[PDB]
Design a protein around this ligand. Structure first.
Ligand SMILES: NC(=O)c1ccc[n+]([C@@H]2O[C@H](COP(=O)([O-])OP(=O)(O)OC[C@H]3O[C@@H](n4cnc5c(N)ncnc54)[C@H](OP(=O)(O)O)[C@@H]3O)[C@@H](O)[C@H]2O)c1
Ligand code: SF4
Ligand code: SF4
Ligand code: SF4
Lengths: 208, 57, 176, 152, 80, 114, 319
């Protein structure tokens, strides 16, 4: 197995079992699930209530530093019945580790800004309001970044047909650059790649 | 805490345009392309809409 | 490990501080380089005198397209619909339909030359080894009605030089 | 009678022999424009001096990708240029948009916004098929301003 | 500062809009158990009596007016 | 449904709100109409504002009526300032676009199966 | 056969041809065929580069250019052979130092009323003017009403059109005024009597054609183009100074393209409102457009900001 297969390492997988055992111990009002990614990373499934609270515990302590906020992001899943998702991602400079914090939501239910905890979620929260539509309350500012001034669709979610709904073109009949509905010169062919037989037995979905 | 229970059937409005009421979506289990016997392309209930005209350019 | 830069202290003694007061007030620095390191113009210029001289390349270069044919010609392409299906940009467009004898070939083959992103993914998927990125940067015509190519633009553009192409692959094909 | 058609061996040789191109950096293609004004292939001093202000130019150049929010800007700039103006797009993204051609926030093609003249085709055109694309535009003035006054 | 100040200004305005009230300039008009319009429309009337004559109505006031009585009166005790 | 509302509570403070920013629009249409150096009849600018606010009329719910606002509260930032150049505005009033039939027999001679 | 929706990159089954279609009017029609889909073959006379400002008009592979002279009976026969409808806007103002101008409303509109009739065009069209009357006036205004007589002989189906004095954006009609910074405004001829004509706004005329372009059932039956209300005053020349607050040319400059101390001064005051019985507009409608509102746009001068314009006109009388 050795030559071409990535050699594993156990030690990293013993501790991040422990150190994550007990952050389901000392904040049970919030944390509803925790696990260990086979590559030695953690995922803490947290109710939407604690967001400002939990980080603040992760913000300072002598057993968990997690000062460096690296990557806020999102994922949007239909047939999850609460659409979107957040994923915070935080590096603790002293202890050399990554621990990610997953919090679900919907469009209508607001989520509360993390901005006083870290000042680097200032932009990453302005963006998401543009793309997916999640609305972060009590945010020192909320505006439009990455997108034009016209997009009323909030694209990256799964209902926006790739080409947006209005192509643009300039005409000299007056003196503006105006917007006419999208008319392509090629279909954007849809290929179909998904092959049968279920090559993965381990992930086998429940028998049903 | 402001829990404020109520019941209003969830709906959302304004983001798409006229394609709200014009169309009819469909929810169906894919049928297994029959040229091969692999049974794993089943098992997820997708949805896909009506088809409107494609013309020639 | 580490290093520490810009951590130093002035010496503070009258053997030194003249050396820093013979500098501010007499400009003993600042004429050191740009009184000199500028001139230093006496080196031979480096210019490729363009309309005539030209610069280096390598046998793996990418550029204008072609379709070869064997000895007495078969239009080497068999229309197996691959160089179409790995194409990131989706430039390629292919329509086969059985030729009279019954050997299959193409009808429409169109590489758009605006969309093509110059991968080197369509040189490397063709099993019968037809379609090949040429090494000539001949390009730049004045109308976008043009760069779209048909089949029977390509073949010529790939029979205009096959003395260029057929002698590169036989340098390069031993590596991959 | 014949003096006019001999006069256009002056004015139609003046406008082709000094060009003051604007450039638009936007995307990858800008760097393979720079190397046209770096000393290898030396753009200037072959008759075309490089960038000036918007007002003083002749041939604007579009590199890069044109999103929605950049269209209202271009259209405006193309106007202010003086008369003898042209538009030479380059790169696979001013021709119908590289890829991104199916995206939501990219205008498709930049011919749609302005009356473009000469084209060039590929992520970065190789800093060569640029100049080859101009020695098209210095040969695309064979036109005569005779035979508008002097026929009709 | 006269009750001929605030009854003159008010009563012509309500006529001046092109919409519903046809000389109901009687000072009582009670708005939609009375004459009737859309709630948003009643919220239009409030503004033009402020740019005119000077005023605000910042507050829940405009919700209770319901009649050129109260508006005159709420103006009456306001200015003088 | 149990989730915290955004600003409003039920329908009143909400429908005090939509009444409100109306005026910020209604009081400022025209200062722009001289500012962009765009020429239109200033009353058009007061028809569209009132053409839009009457549009979404059937809304049954808070947190929707607050959602739309958060959009509407924004625009007054850009427009009352200049972050648009004439051509993000005028796109509201569609000058160039040829009319749609919307009737029956005018369709049947042009276009398949809408 | 029409497909899909009329946005762009569509079909809608009509070809066309538009002769002329460089100067003010023709540019502004084709722009309405570079939208609903077409095949608009626009030829042009001498101008290689003056036709470019047009090209982002049809999508791709729609409009297509040719070259022609027009006194050669072939140049009109090589294009039109494939066509459906063909309109004609051709002709201009002042007599050329080359074209003697006499039959360029007679021979030219017939020279293209050559094989077009033969070759099987249909719904052929031509232009007239509201004021052209075969009685004696006006040296330019004449020869135009000859086409209504002389040319109508050929192609019994025309639906030849009769509009008024039009005001566009770049147009030269209402723009001869306000260019009149000069020893002073002197009306024509120093009289405030018969101004003004029916000033319809250029959109409605160019929306008339494409409304008759497949109408159906208007062929042979000519129409004339209503103005707005109603006739107008002298104030129109004051109105200019009310708001204004007081192709292929050359390299340097031309020799003569003047104000023409000739028909030009008397062509503008010829007025002659004419027969109502022509259908002529709402039937081909639905369009009519005013003046007071649409005359700020085309007029922008050295204030460029202030307007504050309250002043209007009755009709005025004879109304
Ligand atoms: N309906 C109205 O309100 C109105 C008002 C005034 C005049 N007209 C007449 O109706 C039409 C409107 O013309 P316009 O507004 O566009 O002004 P225009 O300046 O006359 O435009 C005509 C264009 O066609 C060209 N041209 C002139 N004679 C030509 C010929 N025999 N063959 C081909 N091209 C010729 C002209 O110069 P080039 O040859 O270089 O192209 C010009 O480019 C004209 O016929 C005009 O005389 C109509
Ligand atoms: S070259 Fe290879 S890929 Fe391109 S068509 Fe012929 S076979 Fe299919
Ligand atoms: S060249 Fe690059 S882009 Fe053009 S087809 Fe082959 S791979 Fe796709
Ligand atoms: S490829 Fe597309 S992106 Fe890369 S440079 Fe050429 S144009 Fe800019």
């Amino acid at each position: 197995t050795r030559p071409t297969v990535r050699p594993r390492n156990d030690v990293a997988h013993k501790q991040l079992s422990a150190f994550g055992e007990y952050v389901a111990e000392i904040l049970p009002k919030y944390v509803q699930q925790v696990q260990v990614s086979c590559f030695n990373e953690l995922e803490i499934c947290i109710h939407p209530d604690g967001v400002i609270p939990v980080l603040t515990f992760l913000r300072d302590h002598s057993n968990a530093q997690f000062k460096s906020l690296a990557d806020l992001t999102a994922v949007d899943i239909p047939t999850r019945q609460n659409r979107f998702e957040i994923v915070y991602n935080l590096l603790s400079l002293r202890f050399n580790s990554r621990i990610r914090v997953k919090t679900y939501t919907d469009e209508l239910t607001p989520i509360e800004s993390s901005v006083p905890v870290y000042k680097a979620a200032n932009w990453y929260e302005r963006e998401i309001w543009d793309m997916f539509g999640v609305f972060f309350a009590n945010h020192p500012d909320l505006r439009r970044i990455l997108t034009d001034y016209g997009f009323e669709g909030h694209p990256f979610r799964k209902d926006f047909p790739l080409s947006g709904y209005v192509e643009l073109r300039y005409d000299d009949e007056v003196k503006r650059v105006v917007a006419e509905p999208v008319e392509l010169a090629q279909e954007f062919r849809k290929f179909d790649l998904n092959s049968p037989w279920e090559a993965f037995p381990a992930y086998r979905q429940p028998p049903e | 805490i402001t829990v404020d229970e109520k019941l209003d059937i969830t709906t959302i409005t304004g983001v798409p345009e006229e394609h709200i009421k014009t169309r009819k979506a469909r929810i169906f289990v894919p049928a297994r392309n029959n040229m091969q016997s692999g049974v794993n392309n089943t098992k997820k209930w997708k949805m896909e809409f009506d088809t409107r005209e494609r013309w020639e350019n | 490990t580490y290093k520490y830069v810009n951590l130093r202290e002035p010496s503070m003694d009258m053997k030194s501080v003249t050396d820093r007061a013979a500098q501010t007030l007499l400009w003993t620095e600042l004429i050191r380089g740009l009184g000199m390191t500028l001139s230093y113009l006496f080196r031979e210029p480096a210019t490729i005198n363009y309309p005539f001289e030209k610069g280096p390349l390598s046998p793996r270069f990418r550029g204008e397209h072609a379709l070869r044919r064997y000895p007495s010609g078969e239009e080497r392409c068999i229309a197996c619909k691959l160089c179409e299906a790995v194409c990131p940009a989706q430039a390629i467009t292919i329509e086969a339909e059985p030729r009279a004898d019954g050997s299959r070939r193409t009808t429409r083959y169109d590489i758009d030359m605006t969309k093509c992103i110059y991968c080197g993914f369509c040189q490397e998927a063709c099993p019968v080894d037809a379609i090949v990125e040429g090494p000539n940067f001949e390009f730049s015509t004045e109308t976008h009605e043009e760069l779209l190519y048909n089949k029977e633009k390509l073949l010529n553009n790939g029979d205009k030089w096959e003395a260029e192409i057929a002698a590169n692959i036989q340098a390069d094909y031993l590596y991959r | 009678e014949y003096v006019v058609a001999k006069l256009d061996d002056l004015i139609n040789w003046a406008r082709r022999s000094s060009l003051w191109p604007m450039t638009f950096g936007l995307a990858c293609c800008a760097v393979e424009m720079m190397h046209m004004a770096a000393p290898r292939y030396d753009m200037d001093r072959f008759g075309v001096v490089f960038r000036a202000s918007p007002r003083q130019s002749d041939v604007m150049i579009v590199a890069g990708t044109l999103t929605n929010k950049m269209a209202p800007a271009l259209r405006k700039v193309y106007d202010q240029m003086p008369e003898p103006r042209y538009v030479v797009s380059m790169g696979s993204c001013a021709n119908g948009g590289g890829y991104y051609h199916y995206s939501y926030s990219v205008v498709r093609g930049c011919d749609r916004i302005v009356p473009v003249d000469i084209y060039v085709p590929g992520c970065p055109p190789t800093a060569e098929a640029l100049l080859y694309g101009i020695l098209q535009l210095q040969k695309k003035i064979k036109r005569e301003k005779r035979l508008r006054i002097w026929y009709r | 500062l006269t009750l001929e100040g605030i009854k003159d200004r008010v009563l012509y305005v309500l006529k001046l809009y092109d919409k519903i009230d046809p000389e109901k300039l009687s000072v009582n008009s009670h708005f939609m158990k009375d004459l009737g319009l859309d709630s948003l429309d009643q919220v239009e009337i409030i503004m033009a009596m402020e740019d005119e004559f000077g005023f605000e109505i910042p507050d829940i006031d405009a919700e209770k007016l319901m009649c050129p009585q109260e508006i005159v009166d709420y103006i009456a005790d306001k200015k003088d | 449904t149990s989730v915290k509302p955004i600003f409003s509570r039920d329908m009143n403070e909400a429908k005090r709100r939509v009444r409100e920013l109306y005026r910020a629009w209604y009081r400022e249409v025209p200062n722009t109409v001289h500012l962009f150096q765009l020429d239109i009849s200033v009353k058009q600018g007061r028809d569209k504002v009132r053409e839009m606010f009457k549009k979404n009329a059937h809304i049954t719910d808070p947190r929707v009526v607050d959602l739309l606002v958060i959009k509407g509260k924004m625009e007054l930032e850009e427009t009352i300032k200049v972050w648009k150049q004439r051509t993000h505005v005028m796109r509201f009033f569609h000058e160039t676009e040829a009319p749609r039939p919307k009737d029956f027999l005018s369709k049947f001679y042009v276009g398949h199966d809408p | 056969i029409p497909h899909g929706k009329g946005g762009r990159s569509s079909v809608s089954g009509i070809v066309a041809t538009v002769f002329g279609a460089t100067g003010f009017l023709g540019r502004y029609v084709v722009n309405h065929l570079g939208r609903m889909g077409s095949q608009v073959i626009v030829p042009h006379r001498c101008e290689p580069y003056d036709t470019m400002h047009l090209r982002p008009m049809g999508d791709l592979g729609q409009i297509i250019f040719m070259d022609w002279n027009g006194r050669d009976k072939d140049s009109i026969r090589r294009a039109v052979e494939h066509s459906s409808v063909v309109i004609n806007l051709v002709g201009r103002e002042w007599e050329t130092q080359n074209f003697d101008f006499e039959d360029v409303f007679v021979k030219i509109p017939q020279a293209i009323a050559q094989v077009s009739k033969e070759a099987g065009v249909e719904k052929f069209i031509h232009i007239s003017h509201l004021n052209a009357d075969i009685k004696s006036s006006s040296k330019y205004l004449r020869s135009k009403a000859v086409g209504e007589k002389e040319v109508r002989e050929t192609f019994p189906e025309a639906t030849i059109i009769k509009p008024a004095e039009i005001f566009g954006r770049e147009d030269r009609f209402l723009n001869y005024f306000a260019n009149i910074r000069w020893f002073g405004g002197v009306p024509l001829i120093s009289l405030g009597k018969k101004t003004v004509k029916q000033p319809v706004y250029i959109v409605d005329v160019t929306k008339g054609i494409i409304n008759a372009i497949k109408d159906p059932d208007a062929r042979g039956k000519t129409f004339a183009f209503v103005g707005p209300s109603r006739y107008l005053l002298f104030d129109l020349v004051q109105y200019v100074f009310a708001v204004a607050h007081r192709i292929g040319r050359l390299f340097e400059i031309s020799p003569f393209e003047p104000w023409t101390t000739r028909d030009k001064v008397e062509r503008i005051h010829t007025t002659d409102k004419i027969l109502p019985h022509l259908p002529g507009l709402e039937d081909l409608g639905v369009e009519a457009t005013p003046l007071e509102l649409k005359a700020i746009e085309v007029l922008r001068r050295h204030r460029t900001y202030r307007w504050l314009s309250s002043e209007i006109e009755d009709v005025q009388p004879a109304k």
